[PDB]
Amino acid sequence: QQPQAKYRHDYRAPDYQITDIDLTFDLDAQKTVVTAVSQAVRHGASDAPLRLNGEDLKLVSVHINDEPWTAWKEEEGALVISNLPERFTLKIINEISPAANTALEGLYQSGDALCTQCEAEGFRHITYYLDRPDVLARFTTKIIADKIKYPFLLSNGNRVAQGELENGRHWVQWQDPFPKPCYLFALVAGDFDVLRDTFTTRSGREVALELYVDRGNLDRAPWAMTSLKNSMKWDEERFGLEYDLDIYMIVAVDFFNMGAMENKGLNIFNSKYVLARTDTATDKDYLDIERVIGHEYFHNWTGNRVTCRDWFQLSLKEGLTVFRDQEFSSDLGSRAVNRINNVRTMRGLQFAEDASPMAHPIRPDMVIEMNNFYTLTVYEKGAEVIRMIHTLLGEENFQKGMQLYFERHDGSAATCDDFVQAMEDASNVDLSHFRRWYSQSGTPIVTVKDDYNPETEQYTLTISQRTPATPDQAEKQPLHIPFAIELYDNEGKVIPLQKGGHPVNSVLNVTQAEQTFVFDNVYFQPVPALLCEFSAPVKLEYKWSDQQLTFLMRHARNDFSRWDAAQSLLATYIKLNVARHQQGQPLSLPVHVADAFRAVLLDEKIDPALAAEILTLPSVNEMAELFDIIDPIAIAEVREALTRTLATELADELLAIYNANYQSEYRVEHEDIAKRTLRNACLRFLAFGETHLADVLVSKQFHEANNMTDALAALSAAVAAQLPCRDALMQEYDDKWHQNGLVMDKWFILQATSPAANVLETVRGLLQHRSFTMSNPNRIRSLIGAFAGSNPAAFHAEDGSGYLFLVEMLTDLNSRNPQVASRLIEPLIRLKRYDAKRQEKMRAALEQLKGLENLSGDLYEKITKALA
Ligand SMILES: [NH3+][C@H]1CCc2c(Br)ccc(-c3ccccc3)c2CC1(O)O
Ligand SMILES: [Cl-]
Ligand SMILES: [Cl-]
Ligand code: NA
Ligand code: NA
Ligand code: NA
Ligand code: NA
Ligand code: NA
Ligand code: NA
Ligand SMILES: [Zn+2]
């Protein structure tokens, strides 16, 4: 009964297009009546039927040119209409029930509001349609509703008509002139406060900006409004792109599965990426609002004006729009901190996916449930692939490629290959080999050996690559890997790269399984910086000495290299001490390693933004990727022991830097954020100082904080170090904040990731907490998702209790909200990375889920791959 996989190689142009669609919604939460009048054109064979997609629709009538049609049949997921003219008007009336829509796909209820989510395939839950993104139609949308309950009736585009009716109903009609695929349709109905502002484009177009929030939330909206203006200005400055309509609407909703959504002129956002005030939102929340606002804005060109031919091309818009949001954040804020954190995500989360049963190329070849492919790979590795193009081309060529891409493909539904060809043609850089990045899954491993010849003053790098087979692909081939280097002399000075009397570009083209690169006029032995700015998404194998790495921490020119060298230095001793833990032996760390971090604390010339990241230890998920078999208990306990050892060895310096970075004024400004990140990085270690000194310092910060960044940092430390004040602070936060779901998400995450022995009992009990509900995806992800994904030590408890808990939760969510269920099953899919006893219990859990009545396709796809 489960759906069959679809394949990229089966793409065929549609037999029918729809050029124009006129929608009427007679809105109600229990029953909504949809009337859809579509102007259709046959492109395929004259005997081909029109095959419309539809899910959970009550069909009322079918007309062709106003003739009630008899030549049709409903089948699973479809309405098949036969014997049609070449051009005709299709009219469908059908009913849907928003209040019954717990999957939050299609038209559904968010509190008292009605709203939509149509990407990927949600529009077919609203009416029978060609729900495929290469069908581009001009939408007009009339919305009829109770005026008191739904005073604001919004859809894409501009208001073209409005009226009032008997019995307290009213209506508004919207027209969006840009042809669109139906995944970009949106409708919102409700009562809102509205923040209104203006942006004037550089050529003088005045754009009305409207942010819709629940009543009472206006004073939480200005930062999101500011961020929207900042996004608009940056896309003009950096990409030369202006907004193309008259209004820009954003609606914040509390119940939302997919983060935020770029519906043309009517974006719909999870409230978490809109609402901010300094007592409730952290610096990270502010910068996440900025990047998500930006992301959705940037889709207006990379996604909307040029869309996707088919869903296997998702990375065409997502890799590129992620690249754009990273460049936006990096330009406005700290580029080094942005790059560092994106590399942490790549190495600590995406690499894990690319070795897992769900591994796929950034352009997938095979999909059962497309909502399963909104992945770290498609997004984050997708962006790394765009960034490699940028590295190979340089900014000027890259922008020429963007310009050619839009010139060729504006107003169409294009492919990844189209984008690469625009870059290649505009730049004259050959990207034929490079295209293999779109079709090959898995993480390449780049191995480097070096040799310095003092007789000839030559330095030689011998560089090899391989990609291990993945479950989806038995054949792997070498990639075009841009491999950036820098060479340092004994004084930390950069050595010019040259060969044979000519300069050599610092981006080496590693295109073979093995190759050598020779550099001459290297007068003294160098220290290399390798894979600079993480220039390709690969694992690097080079036999660093500790000295080389601490040298780079002191001398490397790019801040990213200094951080990356610290990561390599730590990796050795993380691996050492995990092996020790497994044999019952305590942490061992050479003095000279602690001294490298001491020097970072005491170096006045280092940007505090960088120092903070160097002093932020790899997460347990980053640590896991260092190991062939993951021991999650050893990893967690070593991370804590390492924290404690550094806290003890660096106690005086940590406290001095903590105090020196105190700020009495709170500002959401990048220099202030950096000082705070450094202060709070020190706090994490100071929390493991002598128990009473730590307790006082942490509780004081919590109670004196004039912003949520500092309050949450203290609370997190009390939980992490199990300090005496923990229970009191956690109860104070609950009593203060329990009516604020976004704020309580932070508290649920702390509960779920607690090191306490009784964490699972506490998490289970919190299913009954006043601020928790299974009806809200944010609450689910903050409590259950954080437990399973961010507390692998407790999730992987050797008694199997974490797996049984997740099975209970997934048994509910499989029926309630399969998209959220599929995000939450991911930790179980990784079972082959664990020891045999854990694998057996995880398989038993997955086999239980496999046997569920009414197993969703979302879970079926992942379970099948995991149990293979
Ligand atoms: N097209 C939508 C799909 C929904 C979606 C998912 Br699912 C996962 C991550 C993001 C996202 C990624 C980065 C920034 C902001 C948001 C999005 C938003 C989107 O891509 O605009
Ligand atoms: Cl109703
Ligand atoms: Cl809201
Ligand atoms: Na910057
Ligand atoms: Na599907
Ligand atoms: Na060129
Ligand atoms: Na060597
Ligand atoms: Na260079
Ligand atoms: Na509750
Ligand atoms: Zn996106």
UniProtKB/Swiss-Prot annotation:
Residues noted as binding substrate in the record, renumbered to the chain: 119, 259-263
GO molecular function, one term: zinc ion binding
Catalytic class of the enzyme: hydrolase
InterPro entries referenced in this protein's UniProt entry, alphabetically: Aminopeptidase_N-like_N, Aminopeptidase_N-like_N_sf, PepN_Ig-like_sf, Peptidase_M1, Peptidase_M1_dom, Peptidase_M1_pepN, Peptidase_M1_pepN_C, Peptidase_M1_pepN_C_sf
Keyword tags: Aminopeptidase, Cell inner membrane, Cell membrane, Hydrolase, Membrane, Metal-binding, Metalloprotease, Protease, Zinc
Active site residues per record: 296
Gene3D superfamilies found in the cross-reference section: 2.60.40.1840, 3.30.2010.30, Neutral Protease Domain 2, Peptidase M1, alanyl aminopeptidase, C-terminal domain, tricorn interacting facor f3 domain
Keyword Metal-binding in annotation: yes
Catalytic activity: Release of an N-terminal amino acid, Xaa-|-Yaa- from a peptide, amide or arylamide. Xaa is preferably Ala, but may be most amino acids including Pro (slow action). When a terminal hydrophobic residue is followed by a prolyl residue, the two may be released as an intact Xaa-Pro dipeptide
Cofactor remark from the record: Binds 1 zinc ion per subunit.
Annotated membrane topology: Peripheral membrane protein
Family matches, as CDD domains: M1_APN
Phenotype of gene-disrupted mutants: A quadruple peptidase disruption (pepA, pepB, pepD and pepN) does not grow in M9 minimal medium, does grow better when supplemented with casamino acids.
Positions marked as site (Transition state stabilizer): 379
Subcellular location: Cell inner membrane
One GO CC term on file: plasma membrane
Residues engaged in binding Zn(2+): 295, 299, 318
GO-annotated biological processes: proteolysis
CC cofactor: Zn(2+)
Family statement: Belongs to the peptidase M1 family.
Biological role stated in the UniProt entry: Aminopeptidase N is involved in the degradation of intracellular peptides generated by protein breakdown during normal growth as well as in response to nutrient starvation.
Annotated protein name in UniProt: Aminopeptidase N
